[PDB]
Design a protein around this ligand. Sequence first.
Ligand SMILES: Cc1cc2nc3c(=O)[nH]c(=O)nc-3n(C[C@H](O)[C@H](O)[C@H](O)COP(=O)(O)OP(=O)(O)OC[C@H]3O[C@@H](n4cnc5c(N)ncnc54)[C@H](O)[C@@H]3O)c2cc1C
Ligand SMILES: Cc1cc2nc3c(=O)[nH]c(=O)nc-3n(C[C@H](O)[C@H](O)[C@H](O)COP(=O)(O)OP(=O)(O)OC[C@H]3O[C@@H](n4cnc5c(N)ncnc54)[C@H](O)[C@@H]3O)c2cc1C
Ligand SMILES: CCCCCCCCCCCCO[C@@H]1O[C@H](CO)[C@@H](O[C@H]2O[C@H](CO)[C@@H](O)[C@H](O)[C@H]2O)[C@H](O)[C@H]1O
Ligand SMILES: CCCCCCCCCCCCO[C@@H]1O[C@H](CO)[C@@H](O[C@H]2O[C@H](CO)[C@@H](O)[C@H](O)[C@H]2O)[C@H](O)[C@H]1O
Ligand SMILES: CCCCCCCCCCC1=C(C)C(=O)C(OC)=C(OC)C1=O
Ligand SMILES: CCCCCCCCCCC1=C(C)C(=O)C(OC)=C(OC)C1=O
Ligand SMILES: [S]
Ligand SMILES: [S]
Lengths: 421, 421
Amino acid sequence: MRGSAHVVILGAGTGGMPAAYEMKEALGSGHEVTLISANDYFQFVPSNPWVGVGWKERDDIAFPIRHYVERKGIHFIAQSAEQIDAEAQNITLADGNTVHYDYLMIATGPKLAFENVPGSDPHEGPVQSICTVDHAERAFAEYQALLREPGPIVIGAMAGASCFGPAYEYAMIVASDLKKRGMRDKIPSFTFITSEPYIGHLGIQGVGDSKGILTKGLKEEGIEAYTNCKVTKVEDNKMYVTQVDEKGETIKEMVLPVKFGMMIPAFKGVPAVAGVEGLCNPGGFVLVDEHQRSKKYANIFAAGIAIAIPPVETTPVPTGAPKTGYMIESMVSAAVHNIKADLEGRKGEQTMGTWNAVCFADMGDRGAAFIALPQLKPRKVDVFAYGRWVHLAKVAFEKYFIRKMKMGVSEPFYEKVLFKM
Amino acid sequence: MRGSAHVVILGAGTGGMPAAYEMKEALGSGHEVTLISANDYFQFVPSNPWVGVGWKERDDIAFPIRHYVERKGIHFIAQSAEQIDAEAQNITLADGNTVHYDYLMIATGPKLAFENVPGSDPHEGPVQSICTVDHAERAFAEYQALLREPGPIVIGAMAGASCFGPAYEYAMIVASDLKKRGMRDKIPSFTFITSEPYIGHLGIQGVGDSKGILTKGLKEEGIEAYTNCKVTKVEDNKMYVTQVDEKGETIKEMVLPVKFGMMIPAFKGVPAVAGVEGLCNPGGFVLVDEHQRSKKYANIFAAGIAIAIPPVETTPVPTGAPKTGYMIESMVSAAVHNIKADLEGRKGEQTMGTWNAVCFADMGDRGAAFIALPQLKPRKVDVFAYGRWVHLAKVAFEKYFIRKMKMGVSEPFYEKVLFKM
Ligand SMILES: Cc1cc2nc3c(=O)[nH]c(=O)nc-3n(C[C@H](O)[C@H](O)[C@H](O)COP(=O)(O)OP(=O)(O)OC[C@H]3O[C@@H](n4cnc5c(N)ncnc54)[C@H](O)[C@@H]3O)c2cc1C
Ligand SMILES: Cc1cc2nc3c(=O)[nH]c(=O)nc-3n(C[C@H](O)[C@H](O)[C@H](O)COP(=O)(O)OP(=O)(O)OC[C@H]3O[C@@H](n4cnc5c(N)ncnc54)[C@H](O)[C@@H]3O)c2cc1C
Ligand SMILES: CCCCCCCCCCCCO[C@@H]1O[C@H](CO)[C@@H](O[C@H]2O[C@H](CO)[C@@H](O)[C@H](O)[C@H]2O)[C@H](O)[C@H]1O
Ligand SMILES: CCCCCCCCCCCCO[C@@H]1O[C@H](CO)[C@@H](O[C@H]2O[C@H](CO)[C@@H](O)[C@H](O)[C@H]2O)[C@H](O)[C@H]1O
Ligand SMILES: CCCCCCCCCCC1=C(C)C(=O)C(OC)=C(OC)C1=O
Ligand SMILES: CCCCCCCCCCC1=C(C)C(=O)C(OC)=C(OC)C1=O
Ligand SMILES: [S]
Ligand SMILES: [S]
């Protein structure tokens, strides 16, 4: 309303949950902050591969949201948005109720585009997913069925994927868990299929010696690896794979039987968002300026995987660059600042800062991690690390981030760099 | 004087130069800041290996100090301190004049202890040094004489050394320069001798895969490498080397002829400082608290290589852990803050923060670098990197640091982390 704006945050995920707390903190009791999300629970996404192999339980990485945001003065609606009318500024929910907003911050993350590859939906066949806790639990279940009746395994990333790390993580921990159970030698074949032009490209043209280390890692585990691949369909428990050359011409086709599989799908924008006329690129990603503000609607901001980021490269098989946690938090922070400035006469000048990618993977006793910035080479920082300490660090962050989501955020998150003083 | 303290900074090096500017900045026109140093010029120490092989010139990495500090209100005395009387608070200079101080900040760096190994002084034989620009120029001269009359090369680090990176850097760029000149095959033998218990220990129990990468690096260049070594003497153009086992027992002795050599010496405290009764440990390093204040004299602070840091390990051949730039700058910053607090009633609470080590080495087209913290494993950060970008980064820092030394320091130096916004 006039003088008491209603700010709606769409999606309670890695960007959206912190955004709710930071928004309420920044605005105070004079304005209304409402968080709207498809699920009634928060989940720590980087832990999903471990759930998918059974090293973690849902209850470890997920919790109900309502009480934690409400104790902070934030309204929570556990309902999916089905339609957004940007002209009238009304959101229509699954149940048919509509919610008016003065500002909308979209943090809806990715739509998992299984439709790109007929038969690839985890409910349609043997190729599973570890992108969500619902999918990871399902993947483990299928993993157990593999144990009962051993057969070929196929893990990897689809054409158009942007999130490659989890594919490698999952393959390594599956190989490890097989050994730990003494079942590894019952597997007919273990294949790694990726849309990357080479092993360890990671959608970022490689980082440190990611290529040499991931290549040798897969070999060590007796995992056969193919690059420049796209899966055309999954059918009759078989994966149909087409491999191209640098010029995108077929150098071979393969038909791989799968008893158990997991392929990272391409990400698109969610339908309710993609469906807003003139808001998104053809992929369904919100077109924003450096201040995180929609280029079409002044009262619409966006953050996280939901936003569009121009490609810097064009690979033989389409691939994308990942949008990761540190950059997402900078996006959120910028959006909150600029919305507040809008509510106070100023035009917020805050930006996301320099593009970067940061990823951690835990293999059990030790981990791998990388930092790359900015996007194009030669970089200012281009590092890949492996060791027991990386494992200890992922463990620590998960427990920290989760506690933070229950307690509140009133400061710049990554003051985590207090381990210097 | 009363109400207008005289603050003396001893040593215009990596810690001492910034300390002068930061001290004057912090204190203002009400107090007197005097910088006293053995040489009339500043030198960028990490560039010395390159001078030693002729890839850089003195004029590139060194400049006269007087004008730059004086334009800032700082007094400069280009004279070595020979005696410090801590009771009377008088410094006696080489010329015999004495300077009274109310506060003394010691930043005198290392004494290069060539005396530990008879015949090792660069002026006494074939084993040279790249620790100072005077020594690096001399080393290059000897390098040219090697070119005219090829013979065995020996590079490495002595017992008690704490600065291992430069040894590896120097060996690699010597090997490279030999190739570039087409002289590499005229060398009878190229040996690497170190006091480290293994290749890439670096005085820090290794960092990332420093071991595997430095080992393979030396092999690639046909450099034969021996660890757990100490040099007992240099004599008749021969290096007498004793190699021990884990229990410090001799497993072999070697006599190596040297036409051209470079060994990093052990560091001790400088005589004028070590000579202050009750100030130093037996090595000549100033015993300080967490606030950088002498444990014996309240008006004496210290920073940089000059301070004592307890060992965390005890290797078969004595070795030390390096004191590097980021930590040194934190020491300086802490000292300046706490002296100012002293001049204003408060007890300064500022500390150096977490122990860390950071080193960059440039091989020509690409570089190697590491970050380790804290001192003991498992660490919070333990990373080793290599690439063209590391080279570009060392180049950039040298030019930045040098400009900063000419222009002044009024802020926390490493706001260099502005490459994020
Ligand atoms: C398996 C995996 C591992 C990863 N590991 C790392 C890592 O180690 N480090 C790192 O920095 N990044 C990692 N990422 C990348 C990244 O950070 C995450 O994907 C992160 O959760 C994305 O943040 P987000 O807020 O943009 O999307 P999300 O976290 O997916 O949140 C989006 C949310 O909005 C909701 N939603 C969607 N549509 C609607 C609708 N119509 N109405 C209401 N709500 C809706 C969702 O249900 C959800 O809560 C990983 C990603 C995956 C898939
Ligand atoms: C070859 C080499 C390469 C290195 N590379 C790196 C690197 O890449 N990164 C990193 O973080 N560190 C590096 N270091 C380690 C370190 O940072 C440096 O040694 C640094 O210069 C030390 O700072 P300092 O102020 O303690 O000593 P110094 O820089 O040596 O300054 C000490 C000073 O005080 C003076 N002095 C000594 N005695 C007296 C006296 N009696 N009276 C008056 N003045 C006196 C000196 O002449 C000198 O100016 C390197 C060191 C060496 C030797
Ligand atoms: C999170 C980013 C995305 C990546 C996710 C996928 C992770 C895949 C894991 C592959 C690693 C397996 O291979 C592993 O590589 C490391 C690094 O060279 C080796 O480890 C080597 O370097 C490390 C430090 O970096 C040393 O501590 C070690 O002593 C040395 O042998 C291991 O000997 C090898 O077992
Ligand atoms: C500054 C810290 C102290 C150390 C100073 C001494 C430096 C010594 C240099 C030795 C490096 C030589 O060996 C070199 O190692 C790197 C890293 O594995 C290899 O490079 C490998 O990893 C890098 C990234 O990390 C990739 O860009 C590269 O494609 C890959 O091959 C090179 O193929 C090899 O030539
Ligand atoms: C962009 C410049 C470097 C950023 C600093 C990275 C280190 C601080 C925490 C990083 C981090 C960790 C440890 C981590 O485990 C993790 O996985 C959940 C991340 O993703 C959100 C992280 O961003
Ligand atoms: C302790 C935690 C990490 C510190 C941040 C390191 C990166 C910023 C500059 C580092 C640096 C560079 C690049 C460098 O080239 C260099 O050599 C002269 C150093 O020594 C003084 C450095 O400290
Ligand atoms: S990734
Ligand atoms: S070093």
